[PDB]
Design a binder for this molecule. Structure first.
Ligand SMILES: C[C@H]1O[C@H](O[C@H]2[C@H](O)[C@@H](O)[C@@H](O)O[C@@H]2CO)[C@H](O)[C@@H](O)[C@@H]1N[C@H]1C=C(CO)[C@@H](O[C@H]2O[C@H](CO)[C@@H](O[C@H]3O[C@H](CO)[C@@H](O)[C@H](O)[C@H]3O)[C@H](O)[C@H]2O)[C@H](O)[C@H]1O
Ligand SMILES: *[C@@H]1O[C@H](CO)[C@@H](O)[C@H](O)[C@H]1NC(C)=O
Ligand SMILES: [Ca+2]
Ligand SMILES: [Cl-]
Length: 496
């Protein structure tokens, strides 16, 4: 469950948040495969409630009605087509599995679902699965409201309703079997793994019981004996009875302390400095690297819905965001996930965004297609951070230095630091309010290298900054605090 099952040489997955299946399929072929991306995390592919108040919010997809592959992203045929086409070019698909619960207990009964399935939350009736009243934890929860009221009580966190979402009785073999039936269907279609949504709200043992019912990956694309990659969403920032280590036996876990701490250091909050990142990783109290799934921001906290707070960096803070994402994929710790979002009308009132519910770009509820501009950027309000040169080139940087150790670290005691990865890569950062100009030891072979942040290596030439490494591995680096990207990165494949 710990191995991503990505093609050899690909070290990152991208979250194509709310993208349609047809758009992901051609993105796999036209960009992800040739640019070296390892895989794609897709939005929940199962039928969900259609919420019209507010109008089609992104979170309606986290309120299941059935396990039919039928959503605003597309139908089962479109989904299968995407998985086949992506796998055929070596790009894996990881599904966001919403298995802790069904929809809100207060939602009106009827057929307001992504494709007409009838459901009645009030009577706990979900005929399209099917699920009934004795398949939920209503009689198990011990809180007065029936919802989770205190995270300091590990029992209610697992047996009660998260914000009113009907809680499935995961201890029942019947329920475990229906969820496995759904996941095995996806596995047999060709998916390489899953993000277990709201894992903190499930008992580690119940999760394990479900995973024990899962098939090996499809033998038409993966080697015999391959197990699905599992990463559990557990928000553990340090002050609760539930620990992410409790889930190490089921697979990897999301390390939310990563993005929260990185945002604080890069923003230079409460006296933090980039020089403190020399021992970044377990040294900062993070989970073991081989159990960690890291990221700068996710679909929740980029809009204030999860954990991380105001320190979280996002595409809105473009300059600092590129630096954060750059440091993340240059650093050896964990398995990296890059975010890809859409633009929404952020309206901050009293410090809070009142439009944090706005769903994907659309026309009358119909999600807009991802259009590509001549400069390779996206239109139709899709941000496509994975297509930004600075991020895309760092994704390749991680592939190139895969396996190389962390070395040749340098820092000015403030916010100017640098380090290399064996003899295949070197990266320099300037986050101080003054210029950086110094000769550093890169550990790289002599030669001329193209900076992959300011440009690219095209036709035996660099379109941006050029670095010259001498016979002793030394090289001079100059970064003004006024640079549009205050960091330079060079690697073995950027050598001229
Ligand atoms: C959003 C996350 O909430 C929890 O996180 C808590 C931390 O665990 C805790 O340590 C502390 O920091 O507080 C936070 C916030 O409470 C969960 O642990 C975490 O799993 C969850 N993230 C994932 C799971 C859910 C649920 O599937 C997703 O939530 C989104 O979707 C729901 C459902 O639509 C939405 O709620 C809305 O609908 C309900 C219906 O009953 C309404 O009651 C509610 O008012 C509506 O807002 C959530 O707001 C939305 O965040 C999330 O996307 C996953 O990443
Ligand atoms: C690199 O660019 C220069 C012009 O700046 C040109 O003279 C040279 O031929 C180019 N090299 C290659 C290999 O195309
Ligand atoms: Ca639960
Ligand atoms: Cl996540």
């Amino acid at each position: 469950q710990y191995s991503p099952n990505t093609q050899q040489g690909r070290t990152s997955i991208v979250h194509l948040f709310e993208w349609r299946w047809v758009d992901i399929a051609l993105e796999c072929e036209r960009y992800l495969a040739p640019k070296g991306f390892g895989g794609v995390q897709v939005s929940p592919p199962n039928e969900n409630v259609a919420i019209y108040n507010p109008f089609r919010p992104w979170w309606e997809r986290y309120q299941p009605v059935s396990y039919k592959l039928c959503t605003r992203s597309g139908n089962e045929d479109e989904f299968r087509n995407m998985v086949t086409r992506c796998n055929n070019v070596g790009v894996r698909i990881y599904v966001d599995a919403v298995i802790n619960h069904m929809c809100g207990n207060a939602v009106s009964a009827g057929t307001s679902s992504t494709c007409g399935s009838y459901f009645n939350p009030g009577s706990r009736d979900f005929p399209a699965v099917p699920y009934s009243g004795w398949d939920f934890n209503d009689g198990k929860c011990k809180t007065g409201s029936g919802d989770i009221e205190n995270y300091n009580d590990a029992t209610q966190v697992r047996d009660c309703r998260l914000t009113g979402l009907l809680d499935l009785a995961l201890e029942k073999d019947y329920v475990r079997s229906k969820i496995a039936e759904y996941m095995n269907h996806l596995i047999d279609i060709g998916v390489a793994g899953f993000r277990l949504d709201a894992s903190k709200h499930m008992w580690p043992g119940d999760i394990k019981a479900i995973l024990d019912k899962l098939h090996n990956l499809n033998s038409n694309w993966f080697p015999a004996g391959s197990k699905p990659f599992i990463y559990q969403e557990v928000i553990d920032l340090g002050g609760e009875p539930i620990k992410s280590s409790d889930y190490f036996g089921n697979g990897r876990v999301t390390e939310f302390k990563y993005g929260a701490k990185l945002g604080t250091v890069i923003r230079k909050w409460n006296g933090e400095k980039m020089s403190y990142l020399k021992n970044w990783g377990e040294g900062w109290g993070f989970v073991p690297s081989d159990r960690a799934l890291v990221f700068v921001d996710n679909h929740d906290n980029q809009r204030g819905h999860g954990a991380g707070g105001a320190s979280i960096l996002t595409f809105w803070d473009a300059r600092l965001y590129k630096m954060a994402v750059g440091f993340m994929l240059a650093h050896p710790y964990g398995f990296t996930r890059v975010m890809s979002s859409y633009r929404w009308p952020r309206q901050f009132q009293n410090g809070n965004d009142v439009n944090d519910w706005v769903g994907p770009p659309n026309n009358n509820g119909v999600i807009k297609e991802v259009t590509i501009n001549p400069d390779t950027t996206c239109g139709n309000d899709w941000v496509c951070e994975h297509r930004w040169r600075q991020i895309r080139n760092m994704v390749i940087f991680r592939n190139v230095v895969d396996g190389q150790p962390f070395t040749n670290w340098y820092d000015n005691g403030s916010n100017q630091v640098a380090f290399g990865r064996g003899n295949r890569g070197f990266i320099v950062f300037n986050n101080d309010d003054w210029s950086f100009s110094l000769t550093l030891q890169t550990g790289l072979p002599a030669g001329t290298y193209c900076d992959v942040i300011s440009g690219d290596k095209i036709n035996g030439n660099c379109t941006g900054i050029k670095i010259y490494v001498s016979d002793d591995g030394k090289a001079h680096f100059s970064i003004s605090n006024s640079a549009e990207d205050p960091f330079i990165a060079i690697h073995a494949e950027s050598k001229l």
